[PDB]
Amino acid sequence: VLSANDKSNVKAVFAKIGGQAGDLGGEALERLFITYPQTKTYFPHFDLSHGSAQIKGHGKKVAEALVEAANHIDDIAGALSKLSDLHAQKLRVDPVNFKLLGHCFLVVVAVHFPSLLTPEVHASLDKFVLAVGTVLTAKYR
Amino acid sequence: VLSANDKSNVKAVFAKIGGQAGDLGGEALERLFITYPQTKTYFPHFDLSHGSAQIKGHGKKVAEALVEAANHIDDIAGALSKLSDLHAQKLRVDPVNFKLLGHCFLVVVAVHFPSLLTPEVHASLDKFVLAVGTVLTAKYR
Amino acid sequence: VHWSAEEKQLITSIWGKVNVADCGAEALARLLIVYPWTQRFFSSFGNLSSATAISGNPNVKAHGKKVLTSFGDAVKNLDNIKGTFAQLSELHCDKLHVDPENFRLLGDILVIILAAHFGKDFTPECQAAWQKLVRVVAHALARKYH
Amino acid sequence: VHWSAEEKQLITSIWGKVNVADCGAEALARLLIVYPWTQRFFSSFGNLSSATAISGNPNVKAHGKKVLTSFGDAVKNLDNIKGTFAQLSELHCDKLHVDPENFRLLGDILVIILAAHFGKDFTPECQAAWQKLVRVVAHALARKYH
Numbered sequence: 104v105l106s107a108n109d110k111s112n113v114k115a116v117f118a119k120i121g122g123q124a125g126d127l128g129g130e131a132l133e134r135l136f137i138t139y140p141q142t143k144t145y146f147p148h149f150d151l152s153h154g155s156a157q158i159k160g161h162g163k164k165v166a167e168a169l170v171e172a173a174n175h176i177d178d179i180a181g182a183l184s185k186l187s188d189l190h191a192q193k194l195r196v197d198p199v200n201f202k203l204l205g206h207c208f209l210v211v212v213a214v215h216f217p218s219l220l221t222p223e224v225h226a227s228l229d230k231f232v233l234a235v236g237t238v239l240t241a242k243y244r
Numbered sequence: 245v246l247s248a249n250d251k252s253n254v255k256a257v258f259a260k261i262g263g264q265a266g267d268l269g270g271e272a273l274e275r276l277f278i279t280y281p282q283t284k285t286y287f288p289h290f291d292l293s294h295g296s297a298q299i300k301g302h303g304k305k306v307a308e309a310l311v312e313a314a315n316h317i318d319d320i321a322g323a324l325s326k327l328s329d330l331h332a333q334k335l336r337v338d339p340v341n342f343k344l345l346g347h348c349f350l351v352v353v354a355v356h357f358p359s360l361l362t363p364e365v366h367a368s369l370d371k372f373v374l375a376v377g378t379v380l381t382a383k384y385r
Numbered sequence: 386v387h388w389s390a391e392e393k394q395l396i397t398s399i400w401g402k403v404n405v406a407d408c409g410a411e412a413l414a415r416l417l418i419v420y421p422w423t424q425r426f427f428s429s430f431g432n433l434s435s436a437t438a439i440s441g442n443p444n445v446k447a448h449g450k451k452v453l454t455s456f457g458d459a460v461k462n463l464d465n466i467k468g469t470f471a472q473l474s475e476l477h478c479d480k481l482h483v484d485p486e487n488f489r490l491l492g493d494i495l496v497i498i499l500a501a502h503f504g505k506d507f508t509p510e511c512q513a514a515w516q517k518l519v520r521v522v523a524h525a526l527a528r529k530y531h
Numbered sequence: 532v533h534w535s536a537e538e539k540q541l542i543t544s545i546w547g548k549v550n551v552a553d554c555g556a557e558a559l560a561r562l563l564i565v566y567p568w569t570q571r572f573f574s575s576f577g578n579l580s581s582a583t584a585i586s587g588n589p590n591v592k593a594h595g596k597k598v599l600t601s602f603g604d605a606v607k608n609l610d611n612i613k614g615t616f617a618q619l620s621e622l623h624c625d626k627l628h629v630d631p632e633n634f635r636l637l638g639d640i641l642v643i644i645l646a647a648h649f650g651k652d653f654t655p656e657c658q659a660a661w662q663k664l665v666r667v668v669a670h671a672l673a674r675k676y677h
């Protein structure tokens with residue numbers, strides 16, 4: 104579970120990464136389709152070619168719910184009410200596909216924002232994204 | 245998450261398996277050490293030889309917290325307050341070692357109580373033991 | 386990759402007593418219900434929006450018989466699970482993209498389902514012997530990366 | 532088990548720029564903190580009850596250098612990861628009993644730690660190439676069952 108310092112290190116970081124989203128949330132999905140092609144099965148409607156307006160733009164959407172999900176660090180289930188259904192009942196996204204995205208999100212922050220993500224911050228950030236998906240799988244687990 | 249019918253099928257079953265605990269909770273640990281020797285590393289203080297007073301008796305303890313954990317189906321974190329620390333901070337039990345036990349628990353009920361554990365009941369039971377451990381790992385996740 | 390003597394005799398002294406039909410739908414109907422992000426690969430299977438239907442579809446019915454019919458190919462040929470499910474190692478990878486965990490998950494459904502069909506005659510050792518057989522038929526498929 | 536041309540050139544055009552010492556404790560200090568049920572195997576390592584200490588122990592310090600020194604044995608010999616970590620496949624199984632998941636977990640710590648040490652010069656393709664290298668050094672050890 105997140106305690107204050109979890110919830111607060113996960114704030115600290117999101118107070119810096121406020122700058123960029125279609126620049127940072129967007130780089131973790133290009134990292135997802137490249138390292139894990141397989142997850143391209145969820146997007147036949149999409150173009151996945153290096154650079155497109157879909158991974159830029161749906162990219163910019165994924166940061167938001169993680170940014171939003173950070174603003175409501177105590178009640179995230181409700182703060183991601185629609186999303187958890189659209190992912191768990193409708194699209195039916197295999198559980199593991201979250202850890203990879205979650206982990207994909209860590210890389211991009213390790214890319215651009217090194218000297219924030221210290222080991223402890225790493226932990227918090229992990230527990231967070233790692234419970235962001237939990238609340239997205241809610242419907243099946 | 246558990247909805248009513250989850251919480252109620254998980255009652256139904258525990259209203260039958262009330263009969264046996266040092267007879268049923270005890271058979272899922274003999275199943276654990278035999279299928280997964282490795283988990284014998286947590287018990288150097290124990291005798292694990294087919295039949296002993298330790299796996300009978302610590303066995304009888306594990307059912308209880310699962311029986312207790314069933315009686316408080318809404319607030320299980322508190323209902324297993326001590327345990328989650330003694331397992332997560334002290335002994336430091338590898339997360340996966342729960343699913344195996346959890347799964348070990350399913351077998352024994354599939355052993356003795358077939359025509360309860362229907363597919364749906366299986367699901368509920370799964371979600372339950374599968375969230376009993378979650379609340380036991382709480383401290384690390 | 387090694388098979389101790391009593392193991393072989395045990396996975397068969399309990400294999401040939403399996404009703405490949407009845408425990409066929411059972412392993413599959415259970416896997417669609419208790420792990421429903423898996424129904425995503427069976428959209429071409431018809432109406433699967435209820436246990437009653439997941440238990441009861443004809444397509445699911447006779448895909449099960451096939452899936453468990455694939456474990457009899459593990460049992461008879463206990464030294465060469467490589468070669469047997471090598472073509473299914475591909476189809477469960479390059480064609481569909483089914484995450485290793487899922488296999489290991491059907492694996493347990495299966496070790497649960499006979500533990501219900503055989504009662505006391507399915508003993509801890511016997512379970513030690515099958516949940517092991519799972520982890521290898523499970524792995525034979527897990528190869529097209531490695 | 533196959534290594535496409537640009538992959539080899541890439542896991543090394545970035546390997547030799549690794550400070551085996553500094554990114555050594557880093558992968559390990561991170562793995563003890565963010566996965567602390569793992570500290571259980573390092574009780575013979577001294578006081579590990581704080582990040583400050585998990586970062587700062589001498590024993591952890593010079594076990595790291597060793598652990599990452601084990602990945603240079605993957606890089607140079609990219610066709611034979613079988614043979615290299617075959618003795619470590621045992622010691623990470625029959626001796627200690629470390630669940631496969633844990634490896635895969637150190638694996639990610641490691642793919643995170645250079646993504647911090649190399650910034651923009653560690654690109655998605657490059658990541659595609661290492662997180663892959665993880666999954667194989669990760670698997671070489673995962674064998675004493677299979």
Ligand code: HEM
Binds near residue numbers: 166168194235236
């Ligand atoms: C960090 C965890 C995740 C977050 C925060 C997230 C966020 C979002 C958001 C904000 C949407 C847009 C909803 C809309 O406007 O309709 C969405 C949809 C979607 N997500 Fe995720 N998601 C996550 C995990 C995943 C994973 C793991 C996958 C699978 C690999 C996935 C695949 C999809 C797909 C296919 C859509 C629908 C796209 C479309 O039809 O336009 N998501 N997600």
Ligand code: HEM
Binds near residue numbers: 287373376
């Ligand atoms: C269904 C999940 C579990 C339940 C309900 C459970 C229940 C319990 C209970 C009731 C105790 C006794 C506390 C006491 O009297 O001091 C205990 C202790 C213990 N448990 Fe578990 N446990 C679970 C999972 C696990 C797992 C997965 C492992 C590792 C394989 C494990 C290993 C231990 C050990 C080593 C002790 C201390 C024994 C002793 O020192 O006497 N438990 N657990």
Ligand code: HEM
Binds near residue numbers: 454481483
């Ligand atoms: C791990 C044990 C498994 C075994 C032994 C197994 C075996 C088989 C067999 C015998 C077939 C028939 C192919 C043919 O006759 O052409 C098949 C195909 C298939 N399998 Fe599996 N399978 C396993 C696990 C899984 C899992 C975990 C999934 C998904 C989560 C899955 C999904 C499928 C699908 C969708 C097909 C194609 C059937 C169709 O055309 O609709 N299988 N497999």
Ligand code: HEM
Binds near residue numbers: 634
């Ligand atoms: C997956 C990547 C890993 C690699 C490449 C690796 C490599 C190594 C190396 C080089 C040694 C030194 C043995 C010697 O010189 O005698 C070692 C031993 C050891 N490893 Fe790992 N290892 C990995 C993962 C892990 C994991 C996941 C754990 C536990 C969760 C672990 C725990 C240990 C322990 C406790 C030792 C013995 C050190 C001692 O004596 O205290 N390793 N491994």
